Structures are given as C-alpha cells and as structure tokens.
C-alpha cells in the first residue's frame, strides 16, 4: 500500500497500519530508485552521510535492509538454521531476493546447492545495482535463483528435497500474505527431509505477539516436532527487533544449543553479530513472551 509519499521533507517516514502510531524515520540524502514493480513498491535511497545507515531499501513502505545493520538478520537466519542441522547440503530460500541470507548460507562448506525463489525479480536486480555486498552471492554456481511465487514453488517440489528451508519474506500485507498461513507450512514440512530445519521471518514480540502464538501453534500442529522463537536486535525493523521461528521436523532436537557450532568453521571470525553465545541467548525471551518457547 504505502509508496513514494513516505518520502517528504528530506525524510523517509515508515508509517504503516501494521504499526499504527509510530514511524521510524531516516533522513534522505539522495533517492536512487523509486518505482512500482510488478508486485510491490520499491524505494532505495542513500541516507544522511552524517548518520551510519548508508543505503536503505523499502518494499511497500517497509524498511527491508540498510547497509549498517543488515548483517544481523542475515547472519541469524543463515547460521541459526544451518548450525542446528547435522549436515545441511540442500537449502531452500523463499523470498531473500536481496541475497543476504544466501550469502550467509553459502559460507557453510556442507552446502552443495541452494534454491532461491523470490516473487519480485526487480528486488534481485536493484540489490545487484545498489547493494553489492549483500547481493554478490546471487551469482554463485551453488545457487539457482528463480523469479516466482514461493507457494507455487513448494507445491511443485518433491517430498524430502531440502535439509533447510528459510522463509525470508516481507510482512503479511502484500504478496507474502499466504506464506504466513498453515497450508504453506504444511508443504514446507513435506519438502523437508526427516532431519530438516525451517526458519522464517517471524515478526515482532512487541507488535505481533498474537500472530507469533498462532503460527508457533499451527506449525507444531502441522507436524513439526518443535518450534522456538529466536529474538535479534535490528534497529531498522519496527521496534528494533525481529525474530525467527526455528522449527525441527525431527523429534528430540534442541535447536537452542548449536549442533554444529560456527566456531569450528573457518569463517566464524568474519561474522559481525552471530556466534554460539548469541545463538543460545536469542532463545531467552522477555517474561511476557517466554511462553512461545516454554
């Protein structure tokens, strides 16, 4: 819904009815691209050089990435999921057209192939033009990048295809709407191998607690053995955090203690947020929310 109008008087103001009454605002130095795509309104701007945020991307008015803080969400989804799997060789990313989660997934030496399926091919194009440090991964021969709806893709995929499925989507308003639903997760379960792990963009414990409760419950009811929400610090998502529901197909698995610590891997010291202490800490939730995890 929201579009070009959110830039006004030198500021981008993230006003949205998904978070009534509040708006994170970033100063605009230069707009780089602002257009409707086939699916979403896409805005990329350079923020004020006197601030640290760098380039910023928003879809349907909702901030998706900035240069300064993108490493948090991308490291958390990519490493919390793959470090919870015994030997993740085949990975699926639904959404993620900016390439960030793919960049982090492809740090793991176990990965043989990752499919990435985003509905909006302009997101991949503009990420290659304006976010080269996030998009470099897209060209890698381990990846097959497709433009398509994630629901339709999973309905064409065989049972037991993937070790890990990562659902990196926009908010429920817009083309991601059915990806927050039970029918979609039914198929995600089916396309995972017996030891499979999924994680998602699991929204906010401040704004979306009821949805998190609802989704955590229906994902267990579809047949995942366990679901645990990992909370992470991201300044430029609404209220300064986001979470991911980390789900295990197989019973007896505790995703909250890494199974294959990143520290035993050669790229651990290049990460800017994630490590095994952060992984365990991410599943400790405020008392008001701790019931999500038990």
The residue ranges that bind a copy of itself (CB under 8 A) are 11, 13, 19-27, 47-48, 50-53, 68-69, 72, 206-207, 231, 233-235, 239-241, 271-275, 277-278, 280-282, 284-288, 290
Which H or E element spans position 64?
strand 62-66
N-to-C CA span, the chain: 36
**Binding partner of 62, given a copy of itself, ligand S4M, ligand NCCc1ccccc1F, none, CB within 5-8 angstroms per partner class:** ligand NCCc1ccccc1F
**Does 64 interact with ligand NCCc1ccccc1F (rule: CB under 6 A)?**
yes
Return the structure tokens found at 244.
Answer: 């991911």
> How do beta strands 241-248 and 192-200 pair?
antiparallel
Per the annotation, does 40 bind a ligand?
A: yes
**Does 62 interact with ligand NCCc1ccccc1F (rule: CB under 6 A)?**
yes
44: three-class secondary structure by DSSP: strand
Question: What amino acid positions are annotated as catalytic residues?
Answer: 168
Q: Which residue has the tokens 């704004």?
A: 207
Write down the least CB distance from residue 57 to ligand S4M, Å.
7
Per the annotation, does 254 bind a ligand?
A: no
**Does 242 interact with ligand NCCc1ccccc1F (rule: CB under 6 A)?**
yes
Write down the least CB distance from residue 161 to a copy of itself, Å.
33
> Helices in 106-229 by DSSP H: which ranges?
121-130, 132-135, 150-155, 182-191, 209-222
Identify the burial level of 186 via C-beta atoms within 10 angstroms of its C-beta, where 0-12 means exposed, 13-18 middle and 19 or more buried.
middle
Write down the least CB distance from residue 15 to a copy of itself, Å.
8
Q: Which stretch binds ligand NCCc1ccccc1F (CB under 6 A): 3-11, 34-42, 234-242, 247-255?
A: 234-242
Per the annotation, does 149 bind a ligand?
A: yes
Return the structure tokens found at 174.
Answer: 């817009």
Per the annotation, does 150 bind a ligand?
A: yes
d(CA 147, CA 119): 5
Half-sphere exposure of 180 (CA within 13 A, CB side): 19
**Binding-site annotation: residue ranges:** 40, 118, 149-150, 169, 201
Residues lying near ligand NCCc1ccccc1F in the complex (CB under 6 A) are found at 62, 64, 73, 170-171, 201, 237-238, 242
């Amino acid at each position: 819904m929201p579009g070009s109008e959110l830039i006004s008087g030198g500021w981008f103001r993230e006003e949205n009815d998904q978070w009534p009454g509040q708006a994170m605002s970033l100063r605009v130095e230069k707009v780089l691209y602002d257009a409707p795509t086939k699916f979403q309104h896409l805005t990329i701007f350079e923020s004020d050089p006197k601030g640290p945020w760098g380039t910023v991307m928003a879809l349907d008015g909702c901030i998706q990435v900035t240069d300064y803080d993108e490493f948090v969400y991308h490291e958390v989804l990519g490493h919390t999921s793959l470090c919870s799997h015994p030997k993740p060789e085949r990975v699926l990313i639904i959404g993620g057209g900016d390439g960030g989660v793919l960049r982090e997934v492809l740090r793991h030496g176990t990965v043989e192939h990752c499919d990435l399926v985003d509905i909006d091919g302009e997101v991949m194009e503009q990420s290659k033009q304006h976010f080269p440090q996030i998009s470099r991964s897209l060209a890698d021969p381990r990846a097959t990048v497709r433009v398509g709806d994630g629901l339709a893709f999973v309905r064409q995929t065989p049972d037991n295809t993937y070790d890990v499925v990562i659902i990196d989507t926009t908010d429920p308003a817009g083309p991601a709407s059915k990806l927050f639903g039970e029918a979609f997760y039914k198929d995600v379960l089916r396309i995972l191998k017996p030891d499979g792990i999924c994680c998602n963009q699991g929204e906010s414990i401040w704004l979306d607690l009821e949805l998190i409760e609802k989704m955590s419950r229906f994902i267990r009811e579809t047949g995942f053995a366990s679901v645990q929400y990992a909370l992470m610090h991201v300044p430029t998502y609404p209220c300064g955090s986001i979470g991911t529901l980390v789900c295990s197909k197989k019973a007896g698995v505790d995703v909250t203690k890494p199974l294959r610590p990143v520290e035993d891997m050669p790229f651990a010291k290049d990460l800017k947020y994630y490590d095994s202490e952060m992984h365990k800490a991410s599943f400790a939730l405020p008392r008001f929310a701790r019931h999500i995890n038990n």
